[PDB]
Amino acid sequence: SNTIRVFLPNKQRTVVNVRNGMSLHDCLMKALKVRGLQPECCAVFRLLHEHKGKKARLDWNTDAASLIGEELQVDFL
Amino acid sequence: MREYKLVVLGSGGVGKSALTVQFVQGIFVEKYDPTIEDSYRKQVEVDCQQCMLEILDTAGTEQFTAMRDLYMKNGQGFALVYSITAQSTFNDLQDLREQILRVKDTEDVPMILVGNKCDLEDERVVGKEQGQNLARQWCNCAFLESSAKSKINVNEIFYDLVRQINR
Ligand SMILES: Nc1nc2c(ncn2[C@@H]2O[C@H](COP(=O)(O)OP(=O)(O)OP(=O)(O)O)[C@@H](O)[C@H]2O)c(=O)[nH]1
Numbered sequence: 001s002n003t004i005r006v007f008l009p010n011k012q013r014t015v016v017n018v019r020n021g022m023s024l025h026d027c028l029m030k031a032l033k034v035r036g037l038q039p040e041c042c043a044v045f046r047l048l049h050e051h052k053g054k055k056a057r058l059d060w061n062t063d064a065a066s067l068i069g070e071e072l073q074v075d076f077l
Numbered sequence: 078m079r080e081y082k083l084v085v086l087g088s089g090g091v092g093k094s095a096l097t098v099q100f101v102q103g104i105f106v107e108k109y110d111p112t113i114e115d116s117y118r119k120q121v122e123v124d125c126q127q128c129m130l131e132i133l134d135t136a137g138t139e140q141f142t143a144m145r146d147l148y149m150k151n152g153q154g155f156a157l158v159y160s161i162t163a164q165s166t167f168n169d170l171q172d173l174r175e176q177i178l179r180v181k182d183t184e185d186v187p188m189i190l191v192g193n194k195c196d197l198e199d200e201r202v203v204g205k206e207q208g209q210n211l212a213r214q215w216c217n218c219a220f221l222e223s224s225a226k227s228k229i230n231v232n233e234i235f236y237d238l239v240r241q242i243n244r
């Protein structure tokens with residue numbers, strides 16, 4: 001399954017499909033738009049399970065296929 | 078303020094997402110992008126009272142049906158949506174309601190039957206009375222026809238569920 005679960009502001013969440021070639025910004029565009037969120041005003045983090053929920057910041061232009069199976073969190077800047 | 082966990086259920090393409098996004102963001106989603114898992118939250122004034130709504134928008138088609146059991150347990154109120162332009166979606170609701178009752182074991186669960194896409198009158202293949210009869214058959218369960226496109230009875234679906242919840 002080529003999906004990524006993403007925790008969003010205001011205790012919301014979404015699971016998006018990842019198709020090869022898409023950047024992180026691409027896979028999350030619609031989910032952010034329908035919630036009135038703007039990527040330029042947010043930071044996206046990768047949750048590090050092996051280190052007790054520690055967050056690691058990612059670039060919005062990251063290749064999405066490389067994040068399949070990862071759980072992310074979007075916070076406001 | 079008290080929080081309400083609402084769950085939108087139904088087969089694929091009926092407009093569960095369109096209804097939800099219309100309610101939360103006030104915009105109409107014209108394209109059909111199948112839902113996997115989505116939750117929204119909206120602060121709303123119901124009966125002159127501040128309420129926090131957490132709406133779980135579900136996938137019309139689940140590979141593993143057992144996943145539905147998980148969100149039905151947590152759900153307080155349920156919206157069963159079908160499209161008036163697709164008979165199969167109306168017939169699929171019987172199994173869904175029974176699954177909801179099987180999870181809680183109580184024949185009493187706050188819910189609302191929604192016949193969506195009522196703006197497509199020319200393509201109607203499910204009658205209004207037909208839907209009203211099913212609701213009546215479901216112990217006088219609430220019922221209404223809506224349109225995510227024309228903004229008809231959108232807010233009502235959610236406002237009514239809240240009313241049922243505060244018993
Ligand atoms: N004309 C009209 N189209 C609608 C209405 N509600 C939804 N649609 C359209 O019906 C199609 C599917 O809408 P969705 O909201 O994605 O339906 P869905 O139930 O969420 O489908 P899944 O997530 O796959 O289970 C889209 O192309 C919408 O634009 C409505 O009230 N009227």
Ligand SMILES: [Ca+2]
Pocket residue numbers: 069070071
């Ligand atoms: Ca993981």
Ligand SMILES: [Mg+2]
Pocket residue numbers: 093094095110111112134135136137
């Ligand atoms: Mg959907």
